[PDB]
Design a protein around this ligand. Structure first.
Ligand SMILES: Cc1ncccc1-c1c(Cl)sc2ccc(NC(=O)NCC(=O)NCCCN(C)[C@@H]3CCCN(c4ncnc5c4CC=N5)C3)cc12
Length: 305
């Protein structure tokens, strides 16, 4: 008693047991199956032609037979297309959102222990414009969704996620497995990444932060001691190093003077960025900090002149 979806690239099939799992009040495996089929049909125009029209319209998610017939029709169309062909690119943004949701639903089995975030991360990725020279770190990466989104979208040398908390770091291990598996199932390419359990305030992480060109950090809920210690870690970063955060680490209007020479504002430019400046989501801002020690050098040059 199960349902199978054949991979469009010949990987192992996706196997779902019956009764199908319900993930939450807004997500279930039946709709995940239907949406997976629809995404594969977008990926492969021949597949849409091979598949009969009525199949994705006339379906009963509460009927094993109807869900089985839907899977059988898609599976037969995959076989016909595989036969036609007998004669790895980066996923689209829409497909990537589906993959990340699918990876999360299969990994976070008990959510008690995405949408607006996804589109915001996509905006941040578009603004920062990382290259193969960059090293990316999401400081306090949770279950790893931001790292997975960035790794699937950019060509950074490596993407890292560091998470201290036990429950998220444990779920991240499954998120990592499920992501690699689903990305292979669709035949989609992603850059290298690592989800690690650790403390970003450790001695090991002091040098790693110093050597990171792009840091993303959701610092909104951090205490003043974590924030204070992070500013100290950022003070070792290279010129041009960037920090994208949910709360600024220095004032937007920082003005260097004789009384504030110890502030992080002496060595970084800070700008408030917003998708509102065609966005229709939450009126949210993010903060881009760029390491620039010329702020401090110019102040000293002006003291001597
Ligand atoms: C996109 C977005 N959507 C909604 C709101 C905001 C945003 C947002 C911006 Cl707006 S900018 C931006 C940049 C990055 C990110 N990334 C993530 O969201 N990444 C996932 C995510 O879940 N991030 C939060 C994980 C929090 N953790 C459980 C721990 C809490 C305690 C601390 N901690 C911890 N870890 C390791 N060592 C440690 C510590 C403490 C001391 N030493 C981590 C997000 C955003």
């Amino acid at each position: 008693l199960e349902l199978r979806l054949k991979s469009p690239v010949g990987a192992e099939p996706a196997v779902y047991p019956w009764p199908l799992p319900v993930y939450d009040k807004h997500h279930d495996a039946a709709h995940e199956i239907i949406e997976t089929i629809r995404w594969v049909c977008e990926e492969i125009p021949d597949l849409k032609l091979a598949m009969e029209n009525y199949v994705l319209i006339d379906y009963d998610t509460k009927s094993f037979e109807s869900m089985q017939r839907l899977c059988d029709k898609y599976n037969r169309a995959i076989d016909s297309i595989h036969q036609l062909w007998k004669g790895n690119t980066r996923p689209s943004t829409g497909l990537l959102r589906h993959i990340l949701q699918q990876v999360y639903n299969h990994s976070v089995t008990d959510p008690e222990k995405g949408e607006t975030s996804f589109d915001l991360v996509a905006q941040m990725i578009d603004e920062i414009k990382m290259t193969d020279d960059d090293l990316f770190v999401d400081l306090g990466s949770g279950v790893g969704q931001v790292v997975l989104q960035v790794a699937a979208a950019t060509n950074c040398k490596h993407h890292y996620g560091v998470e201290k908390a036990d429950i998220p770091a444990k779920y991240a291990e499954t998120m990592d497995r499920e992501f690699r598996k689903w990305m292979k199932w669709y035949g989609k390419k992603h850059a290298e990444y690592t989800l690690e359990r650790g403390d970003f305030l450790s001695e090991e992480w002091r040098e790693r932060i110093a050597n990171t060109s792009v840091i993303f950090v959701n610092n909104f809920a951090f205490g003043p001691e974590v924030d204070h210690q992070l500013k100290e870690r950022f003070a070792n970063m290279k010129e041009g190093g960037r920090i994208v955060s949910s709360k600024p680490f220095a004032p937007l209007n920082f003005r260097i003077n004789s009384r504030n020479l110890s502030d992080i504002g002496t060595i970084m430019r800070v700008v408030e960025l917003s998708p509102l400046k065609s966005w229709t989501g939450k009126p949210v801002s993010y903060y881009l900090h760029t390491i620039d020690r010329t702020i401090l050098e110019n102040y000293f040059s002006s003291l001597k002149n």
